Design a protein around this ligand. Structure first.
Ligand SMILES: Nc1ncnc2c1ncn2[C@@H]1O[C@H](COP(=O)(O)OP(=O)(O)NP(=O)(O)O)[C@@H](O)[C@H]1O
Ligand SMILES: [Mg+2]
Length: 330
């Protein structure tokens, strides 16, 4: 019913030793070599602390996983171990657990982040091309390793603006891509869910991350957080329908033999396609260009098979200032 456009081969050609995370045996580190300092974050199934690796006296993050659907834990570790040394991927420092409760924590590198609602409006046009390009690099890399993040959003993109460095964090929803597998559609956060998640299409792939990327980008360049602001998962598809149009939605459903649920009968009207230019304002115009609008337009497509691959999106003209800038640095 759907195979991915790129990278479908990858987990087949890499071994079972690459994707079979149930049979991973975790060599736990020493829990007592870490000291938790201060709370820096929380989560659905987690709490995150700034911490010190005592033997080196260094800053790090400790993320205490509170589920024990225990192979979901092995999955996140296996993906972090697999993606090691990948451009712009969080560094994995250790896995430890409490000897008595066997509650596990993941220890990652600390990144001095500015929260995006503060940080994003301080970006220049070049910043945005620059930090999206660095993020594309993380996404492309893991996609080329047969992994889907499935929770791309600002909250999982730590940015040290003074160091001009980017890390993609939170691989708790990351899963391996196997052709034809019916994955869970209850992934990602509401405002970044793809149309495929919202219409219960299960045979998705790495292109889900690109729709999410486009949601991020759209809120950066139009200065509208979140760009799609549905009150629930059904209203989420209505608020996307008001932009992209109901005509191209119906062609997409027919193209994939998706039967929209009956609840949408009363809530989904006929919507014309709103051009991207109607989101241009004076306050957000600094970010606007033809290259940008064109690039957003190839991210945010009902049909996931119409979206740019991360590799393709790096090739885009929008990013040429970033490419040539790095080339002249070299
Ligand atoms: N390496 C890091 N450096 C700095 N802050 C971090 C780091 N990792 C996590 N954080 C902070 O901790 C928060 C939650 O981390 P996260 O890894 O997403 O846990 P989570 O429970 O899976 N959250 P979520 O699933 O998005 O609701 C982030 O939004 C950051 O503010
Ligand atoms: Mg998570």
């Amino acid at each position: 019913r759907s195979v991915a456009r790129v990278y479908a081969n990858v987990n087949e050609k890499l071994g079972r030793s690459w994707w079979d995370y149930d049979n991973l045996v975790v060599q736990w580190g020493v829990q007592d070599n870490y000291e938790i300092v201060r709370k820096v974050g929380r989560g659905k199934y987690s709490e995150v602390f700034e911490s010190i690796h005592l033997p080196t006296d260094s800053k790090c993050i400790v993320k205490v996983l509170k589920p024990v659907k225990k192979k979901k834990i092995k999955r996140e570790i296996k993906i972090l171990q697999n993606l090691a040394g990948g451009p712009n991927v969080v560094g994995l420092l250790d896995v430890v657990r409490d000897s008595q409760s066997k509650t596990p924590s993941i220890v990652t590198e600390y990144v001095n982040n500015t929260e995006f609602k503060t940080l994003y409006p301080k970006f220049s046009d070049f910043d945005v091309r620059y930090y999206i390009f660095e993020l594309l690099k993380a996404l492309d890399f893991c996609h080329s390793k047969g992994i889907m993040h499935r929770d791309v959003k600002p909250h999982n993109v730590m940015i040290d603006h003074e160091k001009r460095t980017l890390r993609l964090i939170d691989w708790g929803l990351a899963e391996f891509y196997h052709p034809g597998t019916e994955y869970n559609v209850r992934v990602a956060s509401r405002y970044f869910k793809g149309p495929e998640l919202l219409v219960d299409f299960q045979e998705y792939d790495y292109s889900l991350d690109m729709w999410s990327l486009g949601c991020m980008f759209a809120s950066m360049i139009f200065r509208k957080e979140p760009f799609f602001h549905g009150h629930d998962n059904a209203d989420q598809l209505v608020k996307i329908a008001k932009v992209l149009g109901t005509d191209e939605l119906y062609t997409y459903l027919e193209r994939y033999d998706i039967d929209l649920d009956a609840q949408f009968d009363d809530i989904l009207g006929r919507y014309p396609r709103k051009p991207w230019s109607r989101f241009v304002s004076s306050e957000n115009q600094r970010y606007i260009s033809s290259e940008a609008i064109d690039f957003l337009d190839k991210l945010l497509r009902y049909d996931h098979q119409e979206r740019l691959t991360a590799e393709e999106a790096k090739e885009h003209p929008y990013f040429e200032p970033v490419r040539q800038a790095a080339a002249q640095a070299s």
